[PDB]
Amino acid sequence: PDPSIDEVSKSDWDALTTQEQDDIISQVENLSSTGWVNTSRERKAEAIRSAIAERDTLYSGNMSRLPTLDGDAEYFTLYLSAHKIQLFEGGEAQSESGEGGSVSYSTGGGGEKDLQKTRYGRMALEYVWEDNSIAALRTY
Amino acid sequence: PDPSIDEVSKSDWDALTTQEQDDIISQVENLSSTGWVNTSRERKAEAIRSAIAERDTLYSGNMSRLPTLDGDAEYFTLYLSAHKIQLFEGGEAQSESGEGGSVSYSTGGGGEKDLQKTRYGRMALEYVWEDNSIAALRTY
Amino acid sequence: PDPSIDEVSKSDWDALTTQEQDDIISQVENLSSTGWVNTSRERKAEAIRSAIAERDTLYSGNMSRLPTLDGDAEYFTLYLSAHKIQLFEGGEAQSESGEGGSVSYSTGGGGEKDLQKTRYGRMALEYVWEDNSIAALRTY
Amino acid sequence: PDPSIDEVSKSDWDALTTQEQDDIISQVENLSSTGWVNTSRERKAEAIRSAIAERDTLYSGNMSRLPTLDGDAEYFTLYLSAHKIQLFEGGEAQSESGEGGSVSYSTGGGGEKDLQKTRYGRMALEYVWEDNSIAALRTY
Amino acid sequence: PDPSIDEVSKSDWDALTTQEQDDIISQVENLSSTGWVNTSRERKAEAIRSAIAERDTLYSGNMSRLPTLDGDAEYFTLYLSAHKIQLFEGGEAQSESGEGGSVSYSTGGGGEKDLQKTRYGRMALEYVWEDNSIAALRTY
Amino acid sequence: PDPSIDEVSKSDWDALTTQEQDDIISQVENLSSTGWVNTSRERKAEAIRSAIAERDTLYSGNMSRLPTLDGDAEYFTLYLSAHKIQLFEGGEAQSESGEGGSVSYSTGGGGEKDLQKTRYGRMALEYVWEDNSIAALRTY
Amino acid sequence: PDPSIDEVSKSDWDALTTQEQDDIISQVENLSSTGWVNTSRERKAEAIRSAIAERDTLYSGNMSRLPTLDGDAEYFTLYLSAHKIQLFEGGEAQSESGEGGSVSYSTGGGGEKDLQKTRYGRMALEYVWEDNSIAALRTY
Amino acid sequence: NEAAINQAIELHGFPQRHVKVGKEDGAPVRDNDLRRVRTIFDPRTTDANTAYFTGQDVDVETLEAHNFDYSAIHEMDMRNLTTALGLPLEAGNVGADGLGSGKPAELRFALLK
């Protein structure tokens, strides 16, 4: 996208023209084979806007002078967006069944925390030190 | 929304016009693909009003002079609202079945506490230090 | 491929011709017997681009002067690409059933982490010291 | 095969004629009763090429001056190839069922690691000290 | 067999006539009531050749001056061959079912290692100190 | 039998007449109600020959000057033969079902080792100190 | 029986008339309500002969000057015979089912050892100190 | 033996700081990440009353000074050398119990004279 999702703050996202937002929305939709096509454009925009805001507030600043977002900020924000869309869709499906067959996926339930709870959130955690507390300071 | 949910206290929410409330309700409805369309407007207003009141009373003040709401206050209040709407709708659904097929979602049961018990509450916890006790004081 | 995936950074990937990208996409598709044929070329491109970016940002640098990517960088990036495509497909299938029979696969959920969650990510981990902390430094 | 798989590096594999690659591919196919016949020749070539590259990069060098590949290098590379072809096919099948009957195989899920996860990888591990850390050095 | 399987190294196996190989293959087939008759002669040759090579490389040398292959070398190589043929046939079957009835075998899952994973490998382990570490040396 | 199975070494078994072997085979068949009638004469000969060889190599010599085969050597070799025939016939059945009814046997899975894994091997273990390490030596 | 089973060694059993053996076989058959009628007379003779041999070799001698067969030697040898006939019949049945109904027996799997594994062997153990190690010696 | 003691005192006579970074079974820490931590904890710029503030995933371990009896090695070495050179032990600035008194003293000083 022309403005990239890592170049955009919450205030910037609101200032983007519809096409520039839809270009980023299109990029997030590439993170699922289904593209979440049955979830409305406004829900995808809310997921992205809240991923951007959450990056800038919860995954910002430093630990021992190191950036707390160590990974690529574009793909971190995209995985964080995909994580949110998957939660708006009701969660990560463990089993599916119907007229046309059945499947079960090896999720293993995961841990208790927010990002542990879907595949996109598990990807996002690797970009942010897996939510570990590496920070250190000293008296001068 | 023109007045944003983070700019509005319980007393302010009651003073809003119907349109200003419905604009915020419309924003909360973006956090589920279903929009909880079968749950009445007045349930949604109660969930938002009680999310606002719970923010201002339980997730307010400081720990070691850090703000106890470290995350974005808008999205925290929206996730806390979505958590409440989902608990008015029953629980978080773990399995669904009918004429049109079946699905199971990987909720994993989770922990015992209020916010742990829904996907929206699990998101909301990340904004408030995951309910941890970081507070400290000196004598002088 | 004429330019190999280990010779290509994120900025280089964007600069490649459609044919040079499709040549690498074709290589990644060789890591599944299904080739993920029912996923769009853009899903595969996004998986590769984000595998390249994640290599260069998360699996780069040194530990005790050892390179942190100890294994072959080509097959590491390819397995990391295959891992992402399989997560875009909803995850690793544990059981499958239909009109034509049924199968279940030895999987067992793995561990909690991202790369543990798919056979391709389990392969990728062996190239990067299985995500272990071997780094050491002195004072002088 | 005329050039044997243990005599061939990644660069050599690329230099081989189609026939003498197919001679090695034919040898790997002897490690399954099914021969993985429904997988394309290119899947098998990719599995072998990446087994060769993985041998030369992850299972090379010494521990306490002992070679890290203690077993026969031909059969190690063939089992490592078979392990990869089996992972390109999904997992190791634990249960199979259909019109013609049903079977379950004893696997026990294995451990969490890559090579533990299929029968060919369990065989391969015995050639490489079961991935144990026997290395030692002195100062002088 | 005229040349016995314990009298034959990998280089010798390759030098044998078809009849001398088929005589040894015939002996290995006596280790199953089914003889693995639906598995090709070339699978069986590969299993035997790789059993011979594996004996000579992994189950050779001394521990505490004791020979590491303590048992009869003929039957060790035959069980090691039968173990491999059984892994080429899938796993060890734990349950079987169809038009003509059903059976479950008391395999119990067993341990994680290669030889523990089928009945023939469990037999083979007794010939090699159950893979124990009895070796000892002095400094003179 | 005229020559008894405890009087016969591996070399002697090969020297016996067909009738002397069939007389011993007939004795081993008395250890099952089914006599393993659907398993060929040559499977049974292989089981007996390998029981004789395994007795002479694995269950021979002394511990603390006591013989390692403390029990009756005839019935030890016969049980060891029956153990092998049962493994050649796929393992010990835990459940059986069909047109004529169903049964489950109280096997309990047992321990991981070879002889623990069928009823005949459990009998055989009592003859050989249950595979315990009673051996002791002095210096002089 | 005129010669009782406790008065008879392996050599004596072979010297008995057919009628004297059949009289002891008839006694052993009284230990099951079914009498194991669908097993050949030769299976029963083998079970008794091997019970006699096993008594005289494994359950003979003294511990701390106490006899190691503390119970009645007749009924010990009969239960040991019945234990063997029951193991020639498969295992001890845990569940049975068919045209005429179904039953399950409260066996509970039991312990790992030979005699623990059927009801007759559990009875036999009480005669032999439950296989405990009471033996003691002095120096002089 | 003297050279061996000097080198052993240098390595083992003094405790040394070992900062361990990251969570056990957690995210790995690379050399460039440790360079920043080294800058915070540098013994060159630290002082006696420095205090440290950290997250839970930073551990300030220590290599204790590992006790060994270099004094007894010195006494043994000096005893060997003085006796080899035919001097009394006392010449090496080392002494022994009882030997400073009575007929035990009288003998060794008679031998020297």
Ligand SMILES: [Mg+2]
């Ligand atoms: Mg990680």
